[model samples]
Target chain A: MQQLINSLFMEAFANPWLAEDQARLDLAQLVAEGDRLAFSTDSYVIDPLFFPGGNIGKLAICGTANDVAVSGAIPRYLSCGFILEEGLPMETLKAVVTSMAETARTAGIAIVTGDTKVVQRGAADKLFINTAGMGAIPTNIHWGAQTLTAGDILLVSGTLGDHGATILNLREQLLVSDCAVLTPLIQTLRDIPGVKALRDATRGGVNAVVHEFAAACGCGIEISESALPVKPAVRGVCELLGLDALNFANEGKLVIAVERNAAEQVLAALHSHPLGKDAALIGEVVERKGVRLAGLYGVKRTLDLPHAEPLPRIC
Target chain B: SMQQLINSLFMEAFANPWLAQEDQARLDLAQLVAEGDRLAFSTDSYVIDPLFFPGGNIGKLAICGTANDVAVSGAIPRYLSCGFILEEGLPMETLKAVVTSMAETARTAGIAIVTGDTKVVQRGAADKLFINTAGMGAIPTNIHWGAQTLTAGDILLVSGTLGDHGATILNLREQLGELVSDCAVLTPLIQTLRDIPGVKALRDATRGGVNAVVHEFAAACGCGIEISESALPVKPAVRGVCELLGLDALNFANEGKLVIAVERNAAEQVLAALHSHPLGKDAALIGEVVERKGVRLAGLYGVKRTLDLPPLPRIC
Candidate 1:
């Protein structure tokens, strides 16, 4: 065992970051600041990390805070680590980092700790970000799947498909140098109202999220097809790729649930926010059933949510 | 504080408490010598299995690898933090062993284990024990090395025979299949080299080994390197295995070996420093920088060839 300790520590020390332990350390022990706090750090590789309006920086902060917020906590601090590829332009890194600080500040969170490593060009697929956050739960509020009642209203921050479409467009432009329109979706959705629980429809999109939310709440969600918002550009991009814009991943969009009475207020709040300008009430929760999307017609249609598996290693 | 972690295995893993206690000692150094004069930091993710290997395990590797990087930059290592991505259902004994190993390694390296972290991922999300270490070290003022620092006529030296560390891990990996013990196959040379001067650049031949290091040197220095094939050292067993597996011994990593670039005048002094250590017994002056445009090796026929790739991947 000591031999193992000897070797592992040495290997860790071999890397400039790990040897210090800041880069590879985990978070433990929650401080109770009027609420229970939990911090988790995860490193994920998102290819083409920079999309239309948002980049890896924003995604990291938003994603981390969302994890805490959805758990009914007030996110207070985040630790960020970047594994930069060798030969990555310094200007690019600087831009992303600056943007990250800006996003964190806007989200009312601070990046108090960070780590950086320069890997040989191909060791990793793209830039991998390890982000961890400390979140303190609100006093007396028990949110999440458990509280979503059957009659709860299902709300979304706004216009679906913008983030997904923008990402696809930027990716195409990267390979073929085409011009694609990108929007700041996340930045726009922060001000919505009556949000009980909000989830960013990223990686798994709205379709997958509805299922997860339903499972968590132990209830089905029924949404109006005509009520869902989809930008024409995102719709076009989805159609061009034979992909469902509703099913595509998003970085700047969110899904929230509230009491039926507060649904309208939440929608109004979302639209009033810069990113939520196109936000709307897309669906509602029910006692028993699977997730369904409202069709172009008045009839309800089953949303065939495929497994979430976006491109590999492009970030 | 170290006493607090000695027998508190569960508590330690549950709370990343090692780093909470480390000093800004090495951290200050890292910040001073950083490229942008900002901060120098490191992190490692250990996914190795068996927990223990020949000379070291994940724990030792975690500490040594991080320490060496900062040390090579002429910095003294001080603080260290760890994150363990633990798989579900891992035996308590196993996890304890890893921590114990970590404790021992930190003590040996003369650094502090100030903070730690743990995550219980679904079994498949990670291997059994993934240890990541982040640390800070100070860069010495007497030495400086960078891509543009290689001028013509600089001498390149290998601290000792290469590939022991990598070959050991590769052998274990072949035997375990995606799992191997992390032990000390590479250390002596680095520890000794730290005391020597006139060393412009030093890098462990890891993951693409000698070939990769040399190729990178060429690209960074904008100067060519000439290695006399006869001067290149390789263990017969390691060479045989490389030939069989079609792996390049040159590109295999060496835990205890170092590649150094120094002015011609300091070459003997540095070599003598390495030779004084057990790990540097076979240390030798292998090559020199040339004004030539690219990498070329002296072949058996006394001819040369333009090369464009590294040997292979072994350790990080």
Candidate 2:
């Protein structure tokens, strides 16, 4: 246990704060007087812990960080819990922690507190990670899907389905790893004057986001197939696999709603960022109840909530 | 269906002012902010095999585990975040019951489950269910107790009898699943203890038992820890089980018990305060901190022996 602790945890998560080993971590230095805190939690139980694009560790940190970031918060502190199978190699745990530390550093956050529990072999599938994050939401940003109006324009950062396609391929036995959307894009989106809401296209993908937006605002979403951005490789994989690219997950993608007039500016700002090079004006909000899609062949269809998961544990 | 589950959950267990806004995945904790003070943050994951146990379920343990962590730091556990990893094909009934228990526990503990995320893995990818809870609390300016504050003359006390929870888990695993686990929220009890003078250090003895916690205390304070075997409060069932399994009761896991150190003068008062609570009925003055830097146990026959950790795993 001591050897594993030193080689796996201490080496991977070594930092000044964790070095202190307090029973409970002090967050005084991380707090601000006027800023409000945003908190979110996510668990990553993806099969095939190691994937082509990224591993479970990277996904765990980015997923929770983005959850708080979408709420217009500057993520600061995170607490991680690891459930390791008894015989999991020491190297695997070390590698996962290394990725987690790297991802947290890139996101400008500290893993302030954590716990580790080892379960007997066969009780768990190798390992599972859970990350809970807290961030400071600046006073100026008052954003939520409720702030969306009927005329709000919807914008998506980059192409869809890269992460989903990659993960599905790996599971089917598949990086398309620099694809993660981080804080810069989030901060930029928050700075836009009429940005009503922001959401990262994760598990349920854009389909889930549109339905949620419609439900929250009591409005309809009209997305054009021609304007949707999809990488050729992701599109090819989806076509072969009989999956809908629009419904596929993207780790580094953002779906934003802004006042119609400010939509062009927001799109341009997104395009200027590397992660948003393929930014597209995908859709618009209408005064209706559900989502309507205008296909490329001049046909229209309804995009409803996905009743079954096309892929499980993609994140 | 997932949205429906979440909506129904909101109506049943977590229909609070914070969760009513369903637009975002994160919770707004900005309102609970304390200026110029540190917020206590901690996380613990519960993977107990039998979701339902004698005194508590995994849900109850998850809440109390994280709540106790923050509470031990002298913080009022105000908010919590729960993340559930569910195995596919798990019974919705089982899920509902577990979640319901979690809601009930949070209500009793006075902390809101503010934010959460759910993921489903294939059946064998995980056990039936696993829960990870992260908690945050505001540390009061008046109270401070930590491993660093432990001194040579400090008196150590156990909140109640030991090994009941550990024995219960072991029995349940071996088909004699009758004994009750002593899992409960220690928030109110710790709050009461904080009022007493000379409370030096506090730690919950969970996964590692009393031996692990004592070793940690001794290592942190660079002081020797000496406890009398006769003074340990152990239940008959627990002792019998330990003897049958060739396991030492002191090294077994406990869920609701806490080991506390206080100024020597305040030991009796602290013990009395613990005894007044129904949960701490079997409280005991177990030991004291000494100048040497190791842990020792005084046998009932007047022989002293150094205490070492046993090879117990996953009895929490």
DockQ (Cα-based) for each candidate: 0.05, 0.54
Tell how far residue A103 is off in model 2, in angstroms.
1.9
TM-score of chain B of each: 0.82, 0.93
For model 2, the local distance difference test gives 0.79
- Please list all clashing residue pairs in model 2, or write none if there are none: A37-B30, A181-A252, B224-B292
Error of 2 at A256 (Å): 0.7
Q: Candidate 1 lDDT, tens digit per residue, A23-54?
A: 22112212233234433434454447665556
Candidate 1 lDDT by residue in tens digits, B1-316: 2212322673443333332311011112123333222223454454444466777777677777766655555556665655555555777777677777777777777677554444444444344655556655444444455545888898988876667667777776575222222234233455565556567777755446677788878888889998877788877767666766876667676656668888889999988888887766788888889998888878788677665563222244
Q: Evaluate model 1 with DockQ and give the value.
A: 0.05
Return the TM-score for candidate 2, rounded to 2 decimals.
Answer: 0.94
- Give the candidate number with the greatest DockQ: 2
Q: Candidate 1: where are CA atoms >4 Å away?
A: A1-315, B1-39, B49-51, B175-197, B310-316
**Can you write out model 2's per-residue Cα lDDT over A1-315, one digit (the tens) per residue?**
734563466567766657512234444444442256777888887777887778889888888888777878777778888888888887887788888989888777888778887788777889888988877777688778888878899999888888888877777764353346377887777668988888887877898888888988888899998888887888788778777888887888888999999988898898887876888888899887789999878687898767766667776
- Cα lDDT for residue B10, candidate 2: 42
